[PDB]
Amino acid sequence: EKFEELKLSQPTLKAIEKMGFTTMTSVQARTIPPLLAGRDVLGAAKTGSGKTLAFLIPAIELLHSLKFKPRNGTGIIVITPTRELALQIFGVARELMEFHSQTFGIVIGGANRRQEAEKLMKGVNMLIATPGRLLDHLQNTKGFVFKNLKALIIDEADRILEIGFEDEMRQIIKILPNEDRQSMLFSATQTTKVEDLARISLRPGPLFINVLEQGYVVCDSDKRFLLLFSFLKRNQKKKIIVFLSSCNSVKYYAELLNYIDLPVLELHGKQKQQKRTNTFFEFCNAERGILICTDVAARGLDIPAVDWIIQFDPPDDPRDYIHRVGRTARGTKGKGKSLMFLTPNELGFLRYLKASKVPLNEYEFPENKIANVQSQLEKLIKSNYYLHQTAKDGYRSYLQAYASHSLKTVYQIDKLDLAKVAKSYGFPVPPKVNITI
Amino acid sequence: PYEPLIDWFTRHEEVMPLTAVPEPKRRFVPSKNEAKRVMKIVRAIREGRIIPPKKLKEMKXXXXX
Amino acid sequence: PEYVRVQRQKKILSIRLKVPPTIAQFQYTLDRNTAAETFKLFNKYRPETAAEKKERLTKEAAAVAEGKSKQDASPKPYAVKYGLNHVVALIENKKAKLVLIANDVDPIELVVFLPALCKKMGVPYAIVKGKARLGTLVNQKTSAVAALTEVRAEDEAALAKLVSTIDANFADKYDEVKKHWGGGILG
Amino acid sequence: VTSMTPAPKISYKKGAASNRTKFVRSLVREIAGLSPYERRLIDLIRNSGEKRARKVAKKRLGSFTRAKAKVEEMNNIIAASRRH
Amino acid sequence: QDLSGLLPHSRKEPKLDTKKDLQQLNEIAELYNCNNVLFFEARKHQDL
């Protein structure tokens, strides 16, 4: 069916029109009449099917049917493992709530605690959060309007369990009310301990719908962005997609490289989704273009057969990266050459690549061929306030992305020279970011 | 008694500042308060309360004779 | 007189008694040629006087008064930085490329954290001799601090070798004897 | 007569300590050195244990919980100096 | 004062801050090697 066929409030209709959605994906078209019906649900769907919007529509329907004040309650609660997925879900949800009247917020470990605290003191009518920081905010923030719980959703309980936040989740649900609460949850696969949390969460009986060499380039953390720029100039007139972690670094690298006037398309959660669709369409039809994107915005959509996969940032799911390069090779008869940047702290990832048993190719670097624009970068950052702030934001979100990373054995912040990271961003002195180290 | 000073805390070096204070706008652009003082002098010269220095040297060159 | 008697009896009662090692880092200070070249550096970066400031203001204001709006272009002013809270403020970013520290301040406690603070912040501090010589290069009576951050490209190579010179001459020579209790020998 | 939840006003003193003020206090600690009863106190730990150390510190202080913090602080100093 | 005059094996420690926290006193008795500890709470300068 269509989104515009179903019974909806008119600002939600304007929202769906402006997000470009008319049609429905089939599994979400299945789950939406139980989503309106008020039953609990679990669901198996691929990461990036639009399954955010699938719950976003009847959640805002519930908030519209209840019309309660921002002081009145919180209601819709969203639990999501990754800070990046949290920002993507939030950025999709912003315009949806913006045509609506209610309130939207963020709770993320790695954000400023007095910020999130003051937002909770004001009250937030739709919460999106990481599991670890929720125990802090429920146990510590006073006066926060918790007793309502109109609903609750979990996304990718595989990833919560694979991180290991499930005990935190049990403490949360033991804090959570149940009788007003309905629980909806999406997870592409399932295990037993997923189902144990599901048996606690799902208050009625639910009906549920279930439907090769790599490049690796070891570089120091300062010169890696420069080498990306050099390799991108050398491979100009070849379409290449670069995978990042943080949307701020996406926007900043895109604005930077457009200031260096080589044509670059950005693709991130802060990008408006109609503009996002325009950029993806222009990349797919232009066939010689630079695409900067995060990991999971790239996960959310199928990829044309590309000259290069370049992964600059650390991965969200390395297992999904191993499956993703295999499905990329088997899907694309045109050869797509995959590479990842490495830092000399990261070589244990390589042995996990040796756990993946796929072959590996080391791609070498000449120190003579260095683009040498870093002085121009620093003069630019000392010049432009706007570029200065976007550079600081990419740096900040980059470090918070490392903070939010699961594999500590692959990534330790203690290993990293933040001076070189700042010089890669172009700062001679690393700016202060309030990060537990 | 007396004994030499222990430098346990100095020997670890901070690679970052203390405060995450955002940089202000005015550190990057030409100074505003300068320009307000400029326009003050402009308003005084438009009222003629301040003589231009070229005109002042013109005055002194005639007044010396 | 009394005041001559006291100012001669001062610096006797100090050296007669054990000074703590966080003092007497002062007067373990910079030698002759290096302080000379440091002053040759900072006289290249004198700040603008009030007269020169007001003069340039009158020039540009007479320009706009004719109007005759000539252009909108000026790179930046570069100068030494000399306000004490401003000097500390330029640290903890860090922005201070070099800091000069006067040995003689009568409230010494205004100053005593600055060698350890630039030590932990890694800022190339140097203890200079005489706050009047700081005030001369900054158009004040005294200054007691002297920070310098922004340098033209003509002078940046001189800056780095001066930093290496100071870290050789100050940080290597006086670091262990900084820890020792000075004075204590009677007069 | 039913309910209404006020926004709880917590003083900014009661929030936390900053990185800046911890840096300030710890940087003052090594510069100031030890007071003479602290010079006594580290030695009295090293000689006759934290029992007699806490008792002497409480005698120097007025109360007991401050003597806890004082002894724990000098233990932090001993741990910062001796191992490192 | 009179009770401190009575039992010599009693002591006359300066007064504690908290009327509410009481476990610390055990430590205090451990630091004074006492086998029975006595605590006087004065609520509102009226109730003992």
Added chain:
Amino acid sequence: GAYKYLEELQRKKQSDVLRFLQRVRVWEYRQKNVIHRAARPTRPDKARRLGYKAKQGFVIYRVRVRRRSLRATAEERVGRRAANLRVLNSYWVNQDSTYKYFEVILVDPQHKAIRRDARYNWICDPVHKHREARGLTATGKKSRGINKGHKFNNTKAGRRKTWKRQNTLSLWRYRK
């Protein structure tokens, strides 16, 4: 700014450097008079939080007192000496077995910087004559004991006040 360093270093008084400076300065001030003019506050941060500004119309006296309170008497001495000045405030710096030392900020209501600059022009009012003589200073209000709290009851002067409450009888036109 550097004032936080001065405050936190100031809280560690019996630390070696501060007692060194204290021991030098007590002898140095012992050379001078009972009352004299200091060029600058030796504890500038304490003077700031008591209200000092570095401009004309702010006079710092250093005063020596033998071991009312000692601090209030120290304020009364420089109040008697410089009558044209109005006493802003005072603070401890140093002490000996023989004498305690205080550093007192006084403000002149005659200087035009003080007569303008409306943060401080209130002290030009003749109701602010000799605040130390009436105990209107900070140490004066402490020794009078004027705050809010049940800990604060009828004390000395207020005691005579409530003795006054017992001493006078109130009668209406129509007797109640």
Added chain:
RNA sequence: GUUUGACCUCAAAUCAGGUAGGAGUACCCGCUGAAAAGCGGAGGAAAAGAAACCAACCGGGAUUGCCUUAGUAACGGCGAGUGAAGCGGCAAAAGCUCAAAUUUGAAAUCUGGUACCUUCGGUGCCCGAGUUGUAAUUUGGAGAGGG
């Protein structure tokens, strides 16, 4: 360089401009104090005054004063007698300012002298004061940077 100069300190001025004292003292505020006197300091009022408050409630909301609380609580050879306060009702109602992180792309601040002017001041110029911090902005009820 045995010279010269910055400071810093301390003196001196028949230098310029100001200011303190004494009287009175009904009321006010401090200090001292017997069987009150005294001292010191002000004003038309003074003081106090914007909670490190009161409460335990369906909470209240700077200070001041009146009525009530109340001759109660409490204290006292629990003898002589001493002797409150919360709340309530009313009068009156008013709130503000510093001190903490940089303006560093320009001490932006002010006294004083002089020349004029529309003079409880204004403008200009010049000495000074001031970075050992004068301005703007911010006093938790936050606030700041940006957008």
Added chain:
RNA sequence: GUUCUUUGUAAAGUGCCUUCGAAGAGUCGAGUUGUUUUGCAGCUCUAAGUGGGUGGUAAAUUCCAUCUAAAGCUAA
């Protein structure tokens, strides 16, 4: 009320988003002495920063309440 001028990328306010988000130490307090009926003063000692002050509360390895001291002004 009339009348003359006042802008200079001048100053401010409201909502939303983002990034931050620093405060009164010879003080608090403790002991003693005097003084007062609990404060004040002297002498000695002398702190903390999710801190501190104060009060109820307990089904008890308690919970909750309520303010921000050690800076200042303010008519009636």
